[PDB]
Design an enzyme around this catalytic site. Structure first.
Site, PDB file in Angstrom:
ATOM      1  N   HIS B   4       0.352  -1.088   0.721  1.00 35.45           N
ATOM      2  CA  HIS B   4      -0.297   0.582   0.583  1.00 35.45           C
ATOM      3  C   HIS B   4       0.839   1.207  -0.059  1.00 35.45           C
ATOM      4  CE1 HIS B   4      -2.022  -3.465   1.648  1.00 35.45           C
ATOM      5  NE2 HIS B   4      -3.633  -2.542   0.903  1.00 35.45           N
ATOM      6  N   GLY B  20      -5.412  12.978  10.705  1.00 36.68           N
ATOM      7  CA  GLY B  20      -7.007  12.788  10.650  1.00 36.68           C
ATOM      8  C   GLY B  20      -7.159  13.006   9.987  1.00 36.68           C
ATOM      9  N   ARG B  24      -5.239  18.052   6.554  1.00 37.37           N
ATOM     10  CA  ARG B  24      -4.695  16.605   4.684  1.00 37.37           C
ATOM     11  C   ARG B  24      -3.247  16.972   5.032  1.00 37.37           C
ATOM     12  NH1 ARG B  24      -8.236  21.448   1.390  1.00 37.37           N
ATOM     13  NH2 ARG B  24      -9.721  20.179   1.304  1.00 37.37           N
ATOM     14  N   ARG B  43      -3.300   5.484  -3.208  1.00 36.24           N
ATOM     15  CA  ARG B  43      -5.188   5.864  -3.471  1.00 36.24           C
ATOM     16  C   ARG B  43      -4.584   7.454  -2.925  1.00 36.24           C
ATOM     17  NH1 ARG B  43      -2.943   0.071  -2.840  1.00 36.24           N
ATOM     18  NH2 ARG B  43      -4.157  -1.655  -3.158  1.00 36.24           N
ATOM     19  N   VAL B  88      -2.051  13.364  14.335  1.00 39.10           N
ATOM     20  CA  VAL B  88      -2.952  14.181  14.690  1.00 39.10           C
ATOM     21  C   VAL B  88      -4.161  14.205  13.975  1.00 39.10           C
ATOM     22  CG1 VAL B  88      -0.851  15.179  15.282  1.00 39.10           C
ATOM     23  CG2 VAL B  88      -1.437  15.372  13.011  1.00 39.10           C
ATOM     24  N   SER B  90      -8.888  15.264  15.561  1.00 40.42           N
ATOM     25  CA  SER B  90     -10.122  15.601  16.211  1.00 40.42           C
ATOM     26  C   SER B  90     -10.826  14.693  16.856  1.00 40.42           C
ATOM     27  CB  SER B  90     -10.689  16.168  15.168  1.00 40.42           C
ATOM     28  OG  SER B  90     -11.658  15.495  13.848  1.00 40.42           O
ATOM     29  N   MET B 180     -11.721   7.544  16.254  1.00 37.41           N
ATOM     30  CA  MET B 180     -11.745   5.741  15.457  1.00 37.41           C
ATOM     31  C   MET B 180     -10.446   5.410  15.061  1.00 37.41           C
ATOM     32  SD  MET B 180     -14.917   6.507  13.219  1.00 37.41           S
ATOM     33  CE  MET B 180     -15.312   4.694  12.675  1.00 37.41           C
ATOM     34  N   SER B 203     -13.313  18.611  18.326  1.00 36.98           N
ATOM     35  CA  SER B 203     -14.037  19.101  17.054  1.00 36.98           C
ATOM     36  C   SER B 203     -15.227  19.251  17.330  1.00 36.98           C
ATOM     37  CB  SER B 203     -13.936  18.307  15.716  1.00 36.98           C
ATOM     38  OG  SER B 203     -14.924  16.612  16.354  1.00 36.98           O
ATOM     39  N   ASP B 204     -15.827  18.786  17.947  1.00 38.94           N
ATOM     40  CA  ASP B 204     -17.901  18.860  18.754  1.00 38.94           C
ATOM     41  C   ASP B 204     -17.738  18.104  20.365  1.00 38.94           C
ATOM     42  OD1 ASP B 204     -17.977  16.092  17.203  1.00 38.94           O
ATOM     43  OD2 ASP B 204     -20.202  15.644  17.240  1.00 38.94           O
TER      44      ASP B 204
HETATM   45  C1  TAL Z   1     -17.422  12.064  17.669  1.00 37.19           C
HETATM   46  C2  TAL Z   1     -16.588  11.014  16.444  1.00 37.19           C
HETATM   47  N1  TAL Z   1     -16.568  10.298  16.786  1.00 37.19           N
HETATM   48  C3  TAL Z   1     -15.929   9.226  15.959  1.00 37.19           C
HETATM   49  N2  TAL Z   1     -15.026   9.654  15.282  1.00 37.19           N
HETATM   50  C4  TAL Z   1     -15.007  10.580  15.398  1.00 37.19           C
HETATM   51  C5  TAL Z   1     -15.946  12.087  15.847  1.00 37.19           C
HETATM   52  N3  TAL Z   1     -15.590  13.355  15.650  1.00 37.19           N
HETATM   53  C6  TAL Z   1     -14.329  12.937  14.941  1.00 37.19           C
HETATM   54  N4  TAL Z   1     -13.853  12.198  13.804  1.00 37.19           N
HETATM   55  C7  TAL Z   1     -12.601  11.522  13.911  1.00 37.19           C
HETATM   56  O1  TAL Z   1     -12.966  11.720  12.848  1.00 37.19           O
HETATM   57  C8  TAL Z   1     -13.154  11.111  11.479  1.00 37.19           C
HETATM   58  C9  TAL Z   1     -14.464  10.571  11.642  1.00 37.19           C
HETATM   59  C10 TAL Z   1     -15.137   9.524  10.747  1.00 37.19           C
HETATM   60  O2  TAL Z   1     -15.712  11.695  11.111  1.00 37.19           O
HETATM   61  C11 TAL Z   1     -12.750   9.641  12.253  1.00 37.19           C
HETATM   62  O3  TAL Z   1     -10.902  10.354  11.194  1.00 37.19           O
HETATM   63  C12 TAL Z   1     -12.599  10.187  13.689  1.00 37.19           C
HETATM   64  O4  TAL Z   1     -10.839   9.696  14.049  1.00 37.19           O
HETATM   65  C1  TAL Z   2      -6.017 -10.099   0.703  1.00 35.09           C
HETATM   66  C2  TAL Z   2      -6.519  -9.470   1.248  1.00 35.09           C
HETATM   67  N1  TAL Z   2      -6.967  -9.249   2.899  1.00 35.09           N
HETATM   68  C3  TAL Z   2      -7.389  -8.134   2.833  1.00 35.09           C
HETATM   69  N2  TAL Z   2      -8.133  -7.279   1.732  1.00 35.09           N
HETATM   70  C4  TAL Z   2      -7.993  -7.561   0.697  1.00 35.09           C
HETATM   71  C5  TAL Z   2      -7.346  -8.580   0.591  1.00 35.09           C
HETATM   72  N3  TAL Z   2      -7.228  -8.598  -1.486  1.00 35.09           N
HETATM   73  C6  TAL Z   2      -8.342  -7.281  -1.324  1.00 35.09           C
HETATM   74  N4  TAL Z   2      -8.325  -7.062  -0.088  1.00 35.09           N
HETATM   75  C7  TAL Z   2      -9.513  -5.301  -0.846  1.00 35.09           C
HETATM   76  O1  TAL Z   2      -8.415  -4.037  -1.255  1.00 35.09           O
HETATM   77  C8  TAL Z   2      -8.339  -3.346   0.025  1.00 35.09           C
HETATM   78  C9  TAL Z   2      -6.844  -4.013   0.696  1.00 35.09           C
HETATM   79  C10 TAL Z   2      -6.473  -2.898   2.014  1.00 35.09           C
HETATM   80  O2  TAL Z   2      -5.579  -4.074  -0.459  1.00 35.09           O
HETATM   81  C11 TAL Z   2      -8.939  -3.377   0.910  1.00 35.09           C
HETATM   82  O3  TAL Z   2     -10.082  -2.510   0.011  1.00 35.09           O
HETATM   83  C12 TAL Z   2      -9.952  -4.886   0.583  1.00 35.09           C
HETATM   84  O4  TAL Z   2     -11.518  -5.277   0.489  1.00 35.09           O
END
Ligand code: TAL
Ligand code: TAL
Ligand code: TAL
Ligand code: TAL
Ligand code: TAL
Ligand code: TAL
Lengths: 237, 237, 237, 237, 237, 237
Positions: B4, B20, B24, B43, B88, B90, B180, B203-204
């Site tokens: 990756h 996070g 960016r 990606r 880093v 939120s 998360m 953030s909230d």
């Molecule tokens: C309230 C709450 N719950 C879950 N994730 C939260 C959150 N507030 C901030 N995050 C962070 O921002 C992303 C999520 C997907 O919005 C994620 O990147 C995460 O780390």
């Molecule tokens: C062998 C194997 N194990 C786990 N995920 C796999 C995989 N072969 C393909 N994928 C798919 O491609 C992404 C992963 C992160 O490479 C993910 O988007 C996933 O859905």
């Protein structure tokens, strides 16, 4: 407008194709859809809506892993009125007879994630796809001269799992492909009353990896994409 | 070159800042690093390496959720020789006294994910950060006149959890912020012998959301970023 | 008074050092405290109160195991106004680089117990110490010319466990020492809103298989107590 | 012969219909099979073999519950060459739109049981039917002018469960019917490499609270058997 | 000499009575045994050996909690030739008809501890007493004219349980007394090959909150002692 | 009449002997009871009521597995005034000194089923028999001059277990017999307020693989019957 999708009700079609890690939404939209317009850009998660043979369809990636796709699929269902979600991606195989570039349809999805147990009072929730969507995909594949295998996929939380022995267990129980989203998406679909299906193209063997050139990649990916799109037209009939 | 990350050993510094979902990587690199060069593009997961006050540092996003960040942090550690990872991002707060824009340091991270139980024979693995990194962050924050609270974060698998009662439990046990990734990153760091730390800016409120303008966002985000970077210089001393 | 502690509010200081061995409590009071008075003897779990460099301090045994120390720390906090519990004990080494007579500070504590799962809706609660208490201890150790390692401890329910394979898992994930109370005490501190820290001296290396015997071992044990006491003084300033 | 089946290889067809009630097996053989002969009577679990439109077919009860049907399906597969097990039973309704005398096909089966976790290293195994058998059944139903709903069934270990709150969870996640064998049979089929399908008629609505009584109920029950039998004919062609 | 018992093979009788409180073991030795000699004082866990009507008997505390008593019972069984352990403790009543000082004999012991699941591959190990020992105790009680209930005890890890509702479940299933050791002791007896029995005196009522009271207090704690000692003689015959 | 028993209050005695095999219940009625009258035939689960030395007694099959017997025992307890259930079944031996036709009395029953965890908030419920019933059976056996071991049985959900190693664990903990109902019956007796006891005849040996053999076969299945019937009379006195 939702926390992760900067769009409004009506911006997305009732059917959404969600590209796996490979395929790009922009590629699908400009190659298979006509009159595509951009409907989302948050976090560079480009979303598009156009038509395929007159049929309205949207496309937008779901991101890697259950936690990521669970976000987007939930919002699409509850805030944009989406009824069907079709994930198109890649997977690894553990079964010897399952080959590189084979198309696999996930009627069901096993997982080592805890999200479905949290939803199902810690019991076994069988994460499954919508039957009709499965049959449409299979039929569309036959119509294109493509043999599609249907069975269980395995949605892993850890691409780099500490327990290598689990792959043997997967092989013993007929798992057709290993990926990281299916079970999460099916869980959301069931939770919010929608329909979902995951279609994967074997990108590699978690056993003895073959050797299909880059020319033998985009050709199979286009196949899976066509299967997905044609399966939608069959579902409308 | 890993599955990756399209780069080679040496392309990344021994210390990596992972933005996070908000921030960016390209923004961090062009705003805080000098002589930054692009080292990854797979990606659209842009990676950069430059210097901060002569110190070599790389920056690259980790994606949403444990499964995603677990991929990247593992590869960075085992294939690019990274020793320290600083996330880093939120987070949402459940505690009344924790306010919007407060900086929170995750010395520990609770979770409802199953990844750590899979690694720890189904027992309780206390997902923690490296102490020195915690103290460096705290000290760097004090030096910038910023009050940083240290405690537990909660890394959720489901942003949209079916069990709303869990937030009360989180509040009862002093959780400072809900995100998360933390628990996933700390799990990987421990598994492969590295060091990690997560820093979040509230953030909230998962209770009574306040109202901080867009001008009261990038200003706090820059703060967290400076804390992270300055904490690295302290760690070198 | 409670069924386990025959004292009244005021008999204990707002800070309590707690060794597993009640006879060790008597040893601490006689060696480091001035004007020490016995304040508890129920079940032979001796408790004492005196002063260290003019600071009121208490010391009482907590018995072996999470269930035992959970009762005492809980009562100390809710019925005797105690704000800090430092535990001073011994632990078994799992890591080859953690030598005998090494001072270990438990920033976090993994566990075999189900007590935190009972508290945290069956999820993963990261049992951690209070950050400032940890920092105070490292600084007190530094001032005494002592190297203190900060990291994860493992709190086992079974001193004699049937699963010998768990020790390798502990080593792989960097556990610094094995004891039987930290995670329980950290769970209590969080549940009842107090602060806690666990400090240990390595009295045996489960690796090379070796315990202790020397005037040097007793020297290191006293150093840990001095670290604990001095750290509370730093905490007040 | 085995301790539970007193027959020899050849006595059973390669396809076996299995109702829970052994007396129901006698009913099936006498009503739909020609030249039917009793091939098993151990423990009163009657088994019969005959032909339907010239096709060799067997029918035998599997008893109530996952543990019971697990023994019979397993032995049928490994000792009597059986390749397909269709179960024809009754289920309780949870969804308001699933009416009495409705034919339900279990593409997947959720469960209360721990049998699949025992098989799948404590992870989530999606217990599914064989795709072609499901499709054959839907088509056979269609040809008979019958609407068949395909989806999730729930296989309970306790007909009389203490957790009444589980029924709401089942409804929320779209479970079409509650029975007690599907997931066990699907686990066996996967473990031993065979194919299985579960078909049910709704004999009671746990919602409006109502069972059955009518010549119409018996008509629907016969329709299910006809669907099962005709579906195997479609499977051969 | 073992890690927690400074004694030698032969210092203990082949049967040991064990209360949780070391001081209670002291009282028992001085009140019921002749020629009582202290054989252990490590960690203050007083152990004694004497004679009761000629029979050599030992009495020693085991501390509070499963982890604590597991250590002592184990060492006694593997290094001091101890064949029978009779715990003589206290317990909290949950049933309405159970009052203070009632004697309960635990033929079984439920628990929320994870120790037996760790020994039994995560399945349900029925932690039971030795049948003959239970019968001896029942008979000894009859001859003494002392009432005694026989049934299930519940061994809790948390005296101060955060789950109040669980007591209702305990009541529902007829739990006679809530204590903190029985299940562990039974687990050790089974793992190391010895026999054990727990006899408790209702120390208080969980519903009414009436803790020990009146001189009647320890007087019944005498009843259980007499029953235990006489049960041993009966067992010898 | 209940859902699975077509009888009326009064058709059953207050004590019912229950083998898993309906045909064995038939044999018992015809061989040991006078004036035997069939009182149930639903699903072929033959039930009978007669006299044994004047005492009204009933005998009825309960089917294979916890889910099956849970249904029958429950209905008998809540709708037919049944106070005592005595299971008379078969079991597989795991210990070396246990041979075919040996009689075992289960005062406790371990299990890998999840039914008791569902009843007991996921904790460990010690599934035990009624003490007096065990003692009555032990005494009846003595008077009959029939040997019988008293201890733990193991109630398995899977006769054909995919986990062979578990038998070693069973052996280690002294499991006397492996069957498939005891734990469930004990769970029902406790939940619905009745008394139960399981007596088994070693039907075969799991290690040696010698299943039933010689005319001695059922002859000992007569021994357990005699013990059960005589234990009832003893219980009445
Ligand atoms: C309230 C709450 N719950 C879950 N994730 C939260 C959150 N507030 C901030 N995050 C962070 O921002 C992303 C999520 C997907 O919005 C994620 O990147 C995460 O780390
Ligand atoms: C062998 C194997 N194990 C786990 N995920 C796999 C995989 N072969 C393909 N994928 C798919 O491609 C992404 C992963 C992160 O490479 C993910 O988007 C996933 O859905
Ligand atoms: C190797 C090892 N394993 C388990 N506990 C250990 C240990 N080394 C030290 N301890 C500590 O000392 C006590 C145990 C009872 O002896 C306990 O108080 C415990 O904290
Ligand atoms: C409501 C409800 N709950 C549980 N099982 C149910 C049910 N309705 C029908 N069944 C099916 O019939 C049998 C149970 C024993 O009566 C079982 O064979 C089962 O598959
Ligand atoms: C109500 C209640 N809950 C839990 N344990 C209880 C109890 N009442 C008495 N005990 C027994 O006495 C000790 C406790 C710590 O006081 C322990 O040794 C314990 O076995
Ligand atoms: C080896 C073994 N394993 C599991 N159950 C066993 C057994 N041997 C005998 N039984 C008992 O008999 C029935 C099984 C299905 O044959 C069941 O009713 C069961 O209680």
């Amino acid at each position: 407008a939702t926390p992760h999708i900067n769009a409004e009700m009506g911006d997305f079609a009732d059917v959404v194709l969600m590209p796996g890690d490979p395929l790009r939404a922009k590629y699908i939209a400009e190659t298979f859809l006509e009159d595509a317009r951009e409907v989302n850009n948050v976090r560079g998660m480009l979303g598009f809506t156009g038509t395929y043979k007159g049929r309205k369809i949207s496309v937008m990636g779901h991101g890697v892993g259950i936690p990521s796709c669970s976000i987007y699929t939930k919002e699409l269902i509850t805030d944009f009125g989406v009824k069907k979600i079709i994930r198109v991606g890649s997977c690894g195989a553990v079964l010897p007879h399952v080959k590189l570039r084979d198309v696999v349809i996930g009627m069901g999805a096993c997982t080592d994630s805890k999200v479905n147990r949290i939803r199902f009072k810690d019991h076994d929730f069988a994460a499954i796809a919508d039957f009709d969507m499965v049959r449409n995909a299979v039929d569309a594949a036959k119509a294109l001269g493509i043999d599609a295998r249907v069975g269980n996929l395995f949605s892993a939380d850890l691409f780099y799992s500490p327990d290598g022995e689990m792959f043997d267990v997967m092989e013993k129980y007929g798992i057709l492909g290993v990926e990281m989203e299916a079970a999460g998406i099916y869980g959301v679909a069931a939770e919010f009353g929608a329909k979902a299906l995951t279609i994967c193209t074997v990108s590699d063997h978690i056993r003895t990896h073959e050797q299909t050139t880059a020319a033998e990649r985009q050709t199979t990916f286009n196949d899976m994409i066509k299967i997905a799109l044609e399966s939608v037209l069959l579902g409308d009939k």
